[PDB]
Amino acid sequence: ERPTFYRQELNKTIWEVPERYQNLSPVGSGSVCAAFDTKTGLRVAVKKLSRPFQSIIHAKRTYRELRLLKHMKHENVIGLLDVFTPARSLEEFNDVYLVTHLMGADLNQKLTDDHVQFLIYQILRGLKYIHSADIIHRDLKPSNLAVNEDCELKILDFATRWYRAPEIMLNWMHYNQTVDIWSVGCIMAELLTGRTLFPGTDHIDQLKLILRLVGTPGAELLKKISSESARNYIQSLTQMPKMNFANVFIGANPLAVDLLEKMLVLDSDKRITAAQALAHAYFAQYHDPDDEPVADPYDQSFESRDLLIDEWKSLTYDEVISFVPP
Numbered sequence: 553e554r555p556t557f558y559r560q561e562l563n564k565t566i567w568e569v570p571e572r573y574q575n576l577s578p579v580g581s582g583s584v585c586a587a588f589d590t591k592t593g594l595r596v597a598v599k600k601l602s603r604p605f606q607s608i609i610h611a612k613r614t615y616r617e618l619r620l621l622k623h624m625k626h627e628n629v630i631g632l633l634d635v636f637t638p639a640r641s642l643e644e645f646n647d648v649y650l651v652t653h654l655m656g657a658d659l660n661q662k663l664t665d666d667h668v669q670f671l672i673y674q675i676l677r678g679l680k681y682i683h684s685a686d687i688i689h690r691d692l693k694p695s696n697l698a699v700n701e702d703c704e705l706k707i708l709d710f711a712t713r714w715y716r717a718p719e720i721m722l723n724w725m726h727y728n729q730t731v732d733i734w735s736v737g738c739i740m741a742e743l744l745t746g747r748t749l750f751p752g753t754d755h756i757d758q759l760k761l762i763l764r765l766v767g768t769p770g771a772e773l774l775k776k777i778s779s780e781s782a783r784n785y786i787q788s789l790t791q792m793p794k795m796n797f798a799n800v801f802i803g804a805n806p807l808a809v810d811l812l813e814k815m816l817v818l819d820s821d822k823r824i825t826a827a828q829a830l831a832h833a834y835f836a837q838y839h840d841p842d843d844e845p846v847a848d849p850y851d852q853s854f855e856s857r858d859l860l861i862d863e864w865k866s867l868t869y870d871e872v873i874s875f876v877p878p
């Protein structure tokens with residue numbers, strides 16, 4: 553059966569939610585309220601989408617977000633606890649609310665090596681799963697990594713470009729999933745040193761900092777560059793050698809440094825993958841190959857479709873109705 557809702561007034565909006573969700577307090581601005589799910593005993597975030605069907609693009613984005621959240625079923629990836637609408641029918645369907653775990657903190661005095669191992673391990677475990685679904689995150693950074701008290705980590709979907717892969721800043725397109733491994737390297741570096749690895753003031757400054765660490769592109773990488781203007785600029789640069797990372801990450805676990813060398817490679821084809829990284833000896837204490845699950849195939853065929861608002865809205869409604877809680 554359908555739950556009983558109650559109506560409230562906060563975030564300048566009316567919130568109509570099932571009564572299981574109690575003591576809503578605004579937390580951010582769609583807008584989010586913290587709540588207590590009386591059914592499960594969990595603290596949750598309830599997000600009321602703003603303007604979900606205002607236009608074709610908003611409607612497709614709303615669908616996109618719901619299909620994504622519904623697919624993600626992994627300990628280290630945010631998942632969907634509930635989705636609801638106060639609407640009794642498609643004709644009434646105007647609002648969408650998404651319920652997830654309420655996380656206390658994000659990753660944004662030094663962490664111990666054991667602790668850095670555990671955090672990066674969980675990132676990589678989550679990323680193996682996301683990548684197995686043929687999804688690329690593209691914006692992994694400390695504000696998209698939630699942690700609880702137990703140091704248990706989840707990757708979030710959610711201006712900083714300090715963790716962005718160099719190919720993205722050069723507008724490459726054709727991105728590999730290993731864009732996300734570059735970002736993991738930057739995050740890991742900062743957990744080890746307590747400072748931003750590549751704190752650029754603009755994208756050129758950032759690229760300059762990257763090249764100083766990893767060196768200018770070698771002939772092997774140049775062979776794969778089709779952009780004539782890019783090639784021309786690159787070969788005009790003073791040749792800089794790759795720094796030895798041990799002399800940059802002083803005192804870090806040698807295994808950490810080794811792993812960083814494998815993540816922070818300019819050529820995206822030569823970067824370690826998430827699945828490979830989980831088997832690296834830095835993670836020996838956490839790695840369990842029978843407990844690093846992969847995702848069912850994720851149908852992103854809708855991305856190639858151009859539909860009407862009402863069609864995206866009906867598809868979304870179908871997804872609300874068919875939701876089954878975890």
Ligand SMILES: CCCCCCCCO[C@@H]1O[C@H](CO)[C@@H](O)[C@H](O)[C@H]1O
Pocket residue numbers: 722756757782785786
């Ligand atoms: C891959 C394409 C990158 C284009 C960036 C080109 C210019 C950025 O390079 C900048 O310009 C000046 C020299 O031109 C110098 O003062 C600086 O070293 C540099 O900050």
Ligand SMILES: CCCCCCCCO[C@@H]1O[C@H](CO)[C@@H](O)[C@H](O)[C@H]1O
Pocket residue numbers: 718719722724725726727728759769773776786818819820821
């Ligand atoms: C001066 C800064 C240059 C940055 C060079 C980045 C090279 C990135 O790596 C590349 O990325 C592509 C997209 O996945 C692939 O198609 C290539 O095979 C690969 O070489």
